[model samples]
Target chain A: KPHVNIVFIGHVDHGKSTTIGRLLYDTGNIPETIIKKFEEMGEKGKSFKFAWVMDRLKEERERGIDVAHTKFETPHRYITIIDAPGHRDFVKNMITGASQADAAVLVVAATDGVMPQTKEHAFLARTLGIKHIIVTINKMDMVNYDQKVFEKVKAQVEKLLKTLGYKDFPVIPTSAWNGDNVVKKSDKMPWYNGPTLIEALDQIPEPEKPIDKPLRIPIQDVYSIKGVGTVPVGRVETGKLKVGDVVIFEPASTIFHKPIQGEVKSIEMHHEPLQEALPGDNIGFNVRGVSKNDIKRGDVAGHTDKPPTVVRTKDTFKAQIIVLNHPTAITVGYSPVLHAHTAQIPVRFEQILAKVDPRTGNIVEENPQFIKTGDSAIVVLRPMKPVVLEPVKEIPQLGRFAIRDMGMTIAAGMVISIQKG
Target chain B: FNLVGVIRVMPTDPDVNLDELEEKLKKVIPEKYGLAKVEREPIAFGLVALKFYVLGRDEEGYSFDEVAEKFEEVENVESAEVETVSRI
Candidate 1:
């Protein structure tokens, strides 16, 4: 089956989850069992409401919001729709979801106009290298299906997209709630002539074949069985890994000449012997001698010819950061939380070159006293603890990091350079 | 054990009577995360925007915020703000 992931990103109650729900409902993919669950829940002092649409988790349904990505199916496309909460608390979840999408749909409300999460999401897609974007002007139901409201919002949305380096963006006007021009074209806007939201989404090409980069895999878990021995579970991040190959484990810092050398007597993938592993597949490997703790998560596995180095510092980084729930001012020398990939480390900022506005990504002021939640800044980071990071432009699979303070994800940015700045 | 970290404490706590809170925080850390006895300071950078001194070297210094969080148990300390040391 051909899989295509389309992410919906914008502000809270801006209809990201609703748009996804509408897609499922209009496509008739919303299962009958799901409706029964919601109906049953409605009897327990809850209303048969909109949140029943996208939330798969029982907790999300009870709370009436979608906190994580929701995977569903449709007839026209085998789609994995990622829905993220627009609030500051869940932006980290949004980052995780956005990083996994092949392309994205940046949602903007037609009536309320452009908002912060809209810009934040769009800029992140640009920074993370999701090139294909469809700017869906949602909430047309509130605008009386008016073309003027659509056009007014489209122009504003286009301006924001252009600031993120998208000069020619595809803008689709549709109501996720009313099914207006969503599945089929809206007769409400006789003036419009473009693909439907589903049509645009279907046309998005999966980036599977094109990702011919170098090989990198970050270990998540290492499973040990009696016969197979030590098996490391992780997703292949960059190029490819093959069996009967010499590799190195950076966290374990152990050298492996064969499958048996790392303490793995054998390697079984899908319960069969395989020589190589490609990007995107989550698999496990059995090692002979390496203990469970020896090859743990945060460790990189690569071919011996080209392996990840254990560095004391990631050196210097210049990144385009999205500041969320950050203190009003960049308290010089503040050690903020660094949430990059799956790890959170306290990071120290150095050479804070400038702070830029989130919407424009242009310098607002040099070294502004502080940045607020939902803002963006560019700064040089000197890790207090050693982290293995390369320039985002070079090894973007592990390039971006989120800076949090007071226990929340406050800022996010991609590395411009790993060399000392 | 796979690994271990050692820490130490220096009473950077500004409040004279915070002996209680200081002990409370010290309950967690192992003996070593504290300031060393160094007579040196950082190299200063003054400009149009926010300016602070960068530690001339990475041998035995930390950012002001890092040092402040360690001794935040005190009252008169207010908060740690990164500043340049001109007199030094």
Candidate 2:
């Protein structure tokens, strides 16, 4: 079966983690001993049992230092669920998870309906180019499993999803706390006749692997082995990588301070050597001529003939950006760290070309003085240093980016044009 | 200053004694690297990988790879990979 990376996104209290826990427990992915341990805790133990399945993972620590990736198997696919926190503070980490996910599950609480994080998460899922989405209306038990409550929330979410350009997605009513309509169909909600959460996951269309595109793997971490030399570890964003292929690392100096070129010596994933790695495969591969000092995180490796595009400090790129959140209006010369793929670099807003209507993408103001929260505009961005980026049309995987400032995700946008240095 | 890291150690076979491997791995760490915590993560089938949280100094020449390389040499261990590293 093909591997699928799915991210569960929503408001913090909306049961995103609980839904995942229920799915894992129902599928027998979690050990009974661990479940028993959680169940032994009094009071909140029953509810915590499910959330504990995910919260106990060291990677899912609070405050959003890292997004958790939990793996399980469905009959149709080997699934990796990225549990993304929906708090405003963790939007950066959430963006990171959404960017890597092939599909998304927007978990909205039935009782509260759509919240602020719900809209933000849905908008981000679309902006990050997640094609498949499953809207699971969680906590149906809190609403007495009323068919009317499920319909109301589904209608609210459907309207939100439609505005964000999503079409034809399953809206499942689930009680993640009670394990209803998650792994098994809910007997209480016979009026709601949709596929269970597990079934909906199985039905998600497999995303087309971008093997035909140019090879691009952004370095996540660089490791130096005793005899293996410098091994750069990352996921294959597009194209394929094999042994003996000549590759170049662009923007090689933040630490390139020039591009580094080398031949692939070996590729390994999950402790097994692979002849070739395709899109979405996390791999650690060694290069012949690259040392640990020569390359670092934020450097992108691609075939020499089609190396990753580098936006040097002198270069400028035009991007259609949406100001998701900001304390004040953003004007010319404002700079924030742009998070793209595995690279995070400061980018200065050189010029505000035009402000476009969010809904129709039509020019609303020519060279607007500033753009504030809920505004969209086309602007020229200059990186504080050399960084790797691609036109969204060329490689959507590397084209999108999130703007972070003041310890929060300020905005998100995609490259429309680039002026190479 | 100290640096912490998690090394995922995979066993050579599904039936490899992880308890004995953990004991051996703990004994092999040099004084420079302190074994902080050990966790077992199920991979697939019956195979489980050991996640070793080790603390080391934040200085030059102090690398998680050095500790991972040492763990790989222990018997029944197929490979040791660094999962995460952070300064504390």
Candidate 3:
């Protein structure tokens, strides 16, 4: 079955978890025994029974399951639902989850209509390169399952999506609480005619795997077994990784000042050995001539012939950043943490080149003195230390980043050009 | 009704005493919201911030920001902000 990643995003009380719960249960992803257990707990548990499916998974994860995302199966595809929690400061985590998603589900509560978090999540999904979107006007049961209420909420979401550059998508009315219009057609609203949530998800086209592009896998963790040598684990972002192929790890250490070269010795995923791993496969592979102390997380691995790009100290890169929330105007000489892939490094705003119209992507002004909230501008950034980055047009999986400072995500952008040191 | 929260506490100056600030933070947080762990993160040149993990309860009259504001009242503290909150 083809695999696709979808992220559920919206406000805190918008039923993202409940919708996911309903989908999992209706599809038999959650066993009846677990449902019975929660059912016996009474009224509170009854209302949040579907949400417990996700919470249970989190419990398993905390107990060393090592699952970063939850998986379920539809009639036609194997879907991975990336949970993007909605909270004030969890936007950093939301950005990370949305970055890995091929599509997004913007969940809006029918009763509350569109909200501030709804707009922020939609903007993040768009900025993170999520091409496909499905809007769920959830909690319809709370609004009496009225057709007029659905249209009103849909109109609000449509206006929000338009400003975010989204043109075509599906908007379905659902009551995840009662499992209405989620897995099956609902008799509650005969006036509405649209595909069910499951059907809408199945309609999303599978994204093409970038097998022809150069290999790039950002290291998430490194391990040294008692006798197995050094093993690095990560998902292949693009191209392929095969046993016996020589690879280069960039910026293995700030002191080395050069990439470390090694040969791939083995490949394994979930303990099943494989000869090669393709894009989106999370695997652990051993490399010859590499040690635990030699490399760490935030490094990128690639074929020696086409090594990962390294941005050394003082090397500047051009990027277009959208200031989402800043207490004050951002000017040159301001440094904040740049989160790209698994790497977090401090980057300085060397210069502000132009302020652009976000809607048209055209230069609105040259050399603006400063940029404030809701403004998009092209700027030059220089990292405080060596880090791996690539042009978004060339390798988007490793190019986009979130700017975090003052304990929140302030801006997000993609690299446009790289000037090697 | 269990809640997991993290707060970022910044010191007024890079040279300020972090150990004392941590003690002050512990005193300000209510006893019901159990302070679990603390971590240091590098912000910028020589500036580091503290991340305090607190286990709270989901109930009325409970606010993480209110506790954060209490941290801000501590001497040598520049800012205190709630980072993330998750319910379990």
Candidate 4:
């Protein structure tokens, strides 16, 4: 089955979870047991709200807020919908969710036009390279099924998307609460002529094949089975790996700077032998000539034909960053937590070369003195520890990263250029 | 263990004799330098890069860096560049 990862992102209370709940229920995907569980909670006496199906916590269900991440598969085209929270406090979780998604469904309420987090979520998607967006102008019931209200919110969203370099994304009007235009066509709104939300989603094109890229696997765990040798488990981030291929596992702290060279002895997925593994495959394979102590969880593996770039400490790299949150201006010598791939380490702000606008990609200030929240800048960063990653153009799976400081995702960015020091 | 590599050996001319070049490479590339088997691979601009397979211990821990330098000194070869070093 062809799978496409779709994330629902927008401001808080914009019906992201509700839209997914309606999608699950209407598509006949939700099991009877789950619905029966929801009904058993005393909502059966009242109207069986589809949104209530997602609210597991008692406090959250009453407040109509989602505090959990829900993922379910729909089979129109084998879609894996990731419902991300839209609250500002949960932006980190949203960032993590959206980072792994191939496309986004931005849900905006017709009653409230273009909220603050709406802009941030859209920008984050754009930064994370999620090109395909299907906007759902939700909560049309609040406006008495008014097309004018939907148009107003659509215009505002369009303007914001245009600024973020996104264009021509399909915008569908939906009322998750009323079950209108969510699963099937809506008779309440006659003026609107667009595919229903599920229809529009089914129309989303399949993601491009990444089989031809170089092989990259970030080791997540090293399990030495009693019978089998060392088995390193991780997803194939890019490229292909075959049996007997020479692989170089780097950042082996025990081995110092020398990368551990090994040959793929076996490859397995779900305990079945695979001839070759492609990108996005979570696999566990054993390799010859590599020991448990030689490599750690964060160590990355690549074919010796094309070695994975192992970033060393004090290595300078250039990144175009957008400061989404910061208490004050980020000056020189400021160190913050940088999450690149599986490695979490603090990177010093070596230089703030230019502060550019996300809309035009124009430099507002050259050699910017400092940057604040909501500011986009081209800056140079120096990692405090040895972090393995590639430039965005070469390997995006290891290139894009999230910047967090003091429990807040301050920004997200990608490496445009890298200069090894 | 097979050491995977692409040996870039420049010929004397654009249309160099394959039989003669292959014959010369057979004598020139040796076990000491990690050249066990050399297969011709057509690259851009009418160039043929020899994809060589070598033993793991043939390079003596220097890998391809020293082997590329050693292959350049071969006869009938104008230059040699090591493309990769891996265990197949």
Candidate 5:
């Protein structure tokens, strides 16, 4: 049994959160005392749904609707579920939530069929390199648990999955509200023969760990304690970081500034001292010679042999991009803000080389002048400011980028090549 | 009035000697911007940002935008952008 990160995404009010809540409740992850307390609170105030079992009422008021990462364990493995919001207002959080996910459960309501948001989520999951997708067609109770309705929704989802280059993904019919076909199989759907949601989840192979590759940790923030020196805090995206290893923070050293180089002096995770940290561990480590202000967010740390690629003004890079959405065509000179790991910078489309079909990812036309919604292409981009990025083939964690414009994610891409200026 | 601000000075090319410009600015900046102390952070190739701390009185005026123009006038400096400003 291994640890896995799974994200739930789909249209609004499609039971994405409810599916997770049900999974938690049925698995005994949500303790009896907690449910009893919620039940008592609901009686004194207003009624409550199973979806509210995650104690999100207060969280929603404080954070204004953000993604919630809930962890639980089954007999098979430990799973961390990233509950992505289906509301359009929190769609950016949805994109960021899927940033580190290994697999996704695309939830769709039986009554609503497929929706624009469903397509957006599906396309984004594919763009983010999530290959294991489980389509949970929820709310079967509303459709009377009809097999025909399930097949209709399944067909609609399958059609879009093909366009997004996803094949043979299991589309499980479930009623997340009633806990049907979730943690336990319901006798109401005797026609269904697939495993329960938990069973299907258990079957997803653990995402391969890149422990042998060069270590890369994108700095989220830096802090200085009273006795300790400057501490860089971030999750280890890949490889292993140990004491005594020399770390380099690039793009931070250029021109008048020398590269911030130092030996790892200390490492701690959740305030516990650790000799070494591996991928997926968020740790704070102190190094020699660098001050708190010297290292800022978006500075990626790595060894000298394989320092992360630092992007500067006028440097051009190529990305395999799909225009998942946009009001109009993306032309030369159209700049969209790109978010990669911890870095965000506006990038200009220097050239549009070829148009790619969304269904097959095959080159459809060469030297396309412009691309619009639903179009895919290989394009060259130049960042307006200096940023850090990595090629996907070399480091997939650092390579994926989500492009946003006018507060909406217009596209998502992965770096394919770099042509340094 | 005195202003402490961060200015970004991008080089015209990657080959431009940054050390020469730092030395040049040590003299030219104080003369033009009224008692300026300049430090830099390397953002990328051909881009070395020069941050300045300047003081001015009734006789001299050192503003963030004005100093940015002065850095742009410096030879071999491609572009100068003001990052932040505050009255000192």
Candidate 6:
């Protein structure tokens, strides 16, 4: 069966990792490599890390933090679960990860209920337009198999979800550590009539349909193969990209081809390749075109229909940021990190259209530097570099952007208006 | 330089809110990583590892490698590029 890529996002230690692990192991999605790795680590007295199954970071073990997004797949359909580190320091990782998700699993632990991070995850997910959500209320076993406790968590989550626009949603209660209502409904949960955790995955639609919107592939790397000349490597994000497809590399505008002549050499989905790759497969392709350095990091590679354009203004943008990180004041000409696609280019900060309170998206003050880390607001921006960014409305894939300064993501907001699509 | 270590955190339950940790370092201070001064101090983040700059200010008094070695000795700090420090 076809499937969608559902990312598990929520506050840290909420068991996003563990729940996915339990689902996979119980559903038989765990690979031998993963099983062996876990066995080896567990034999060494490692905790039954279903989380470690996805978090590939070595430092994660040292700090007990999830630094980057972790991915794993499931049968019937594919699930590129991004167990993103909930730590604020790693939000950049979250931005990068969320930028690619089709749907998400907003995990909320039954014991710890709602926290600030959960709200942020919901906010970001809504901002990103991940419409489908499966709120898994884990660790039900800890509360003495109590349905009232489950209801308490569910009611609290329902309130928070509505606050973030998750108005009518489903919250499934289960114990991730022990096998309780994960893949198969638990006999213990007689009152729980909702679909089991694994069944919910089945509910998500597969991303098999062609991306008719526009082609957007962030060139991760370029290489020279024995058979291929110069191949542009990265995932085919949107639009239908295939052999002989004439696409333009944004920022560079250098026209190239889908290269009728090419060889995969290697491909991967869940870290392994079968044959041809498609959208959401996250495979690297070898195509003939511009030099690797010519397109370096911070540029986009896609079809001309979706070519990157450099715009100068927007009606007004709601910019959220950390002001302290910016050594310079907010204005129209300062260059900063425009974290878009897989590229990070130095761009300009235009004007403060209006001020906002991030907590509630409420308008507060104007022409101010009150915006600090975690504070969201509205502003106007002028791109320093010629970019191919689309208004979030026209193409959600290329709309939102993160402003970085002094090695930190100072601000992030979506483009509401631009030079027009 | 060696990639600073990373961690993968998620709730024990999907119902668990991740915004708490996301908020913990949402606007992470770059200097906190110690990576900004890689050309100068060059230490790693202690505890979690992304913060990788520890070339002491006075370590400028010592050899670059010496400074890097001392950096590895700093508590909470794990994983260093002594090789990178030496080459520099």
Question: Model 2, range A124-236, lDDT digits (tens) per residue?
Answer: 77767788899998888888888888888888788767866787899998988788999988898988787998998888888798899999998866766666777787789
lDDT of 2 at A289: 79
Which residues of candidate 3, in runs, are more than 4 Å off? A24-31, A34-71, A94-99, A140-166, A187-191, A221-230, A252-259, A289-294, A353-368, A372-377, A419-421, B1-88
In each prediction, how many residue pairs overlap at the backbone (N, C-alpha, C within less than 3 A)? 22, 3, 0, 0, 1, 64
lDDT of 6 by residue, A1-421 (tens): 5646566777657777677667766776555655676665544333446546545333332242322233445456655555543444334434443235667787888778777556567656765657677888887877777889889878776765575456556689888877688886788889889888777776776654346667677654444444444545455656656655565666554223232222223443333443555555444454554455455444566665546644533322334443323444566556676776566555656666566543455667877643444445566665544555666766666676666665454555566666432
User: CA shift at A330, candidate 6, in angstroms?
Assistant: 7.5
DockQ winner: 2
| TM-score for all models, in order of appearance | 0.70, 0.71, 0.71, 0.72, 0.70, 0.62
RMSD of 1: 15.6
Q: Which wins on TM-score, candidate 2 or candidate 4?
A: 4
For candidate 1, lDDT tens digit of each residue in A127-177? Answer: 556667887888787887788888888887876777777766568888876
DockQ, candidate 3, comes to 0.05
lDDT (10s digit) by residue, model 5, range A1-421: 7888787778747887678778877887765555666765545432254546655432331232312245787778888876554433233333333236778898999999887656667767865667688889999999999999999889888877887667887889898878899998998899999888898888888888778878999886566655667777667888899988989886686522587878888888756777899987767788888877778767889987888788778589999876766888899999889887767788999999999765455789999989988677899999887777878778877888878887566777878988888
Q: Using TM-score as the measure, which candidate wins?
A: 4
The Cα local distance difference test for each model comes to 0.56, 0.76, 0.76, 0.68, 0.71, 0.53
Q: Chain B TM-score per candidate, please.
A: 0.26, 0.94, 0.92, 0.61, 0.66, 0.26
TM-score of 3: 0.71
Ranked candidates, highest lDDT first = 2, 3, 5, 4, 1, 6
Selected candidate, larger TM-score, 1 vs 4: 4
Candidate 1 stretches greater than 4 Å from native: A32-76, A96-99, A127-129, A209-211, A223-229, A251-273, A287-294, A309-311, B1-88
Looking at candidate 5 chain A, the ten consecutive residues that score lowest on lDDT are: A58-67
Residues A1-421, candidate 3: write the lDDT tens digits: 8888887788758887678778877888765556677767777755465567657654544332313355787778888876564543455544443235788988899988987556567667776778799999999889899988899888878876776678779999998888889997899998988899999988888888889999998886666644567777667989999999998898784448555778898888756788999987867788888877887778889998888888887688999777877899999999999988768899999999999764455789999999988777899999997889889879878888889887666888878999866
Error of 1 at A2 (Å): 1.7
Q: lDDT at A252 for candidate 2?
A: 79
Candidate 2: clashing residue pairs, number: 3
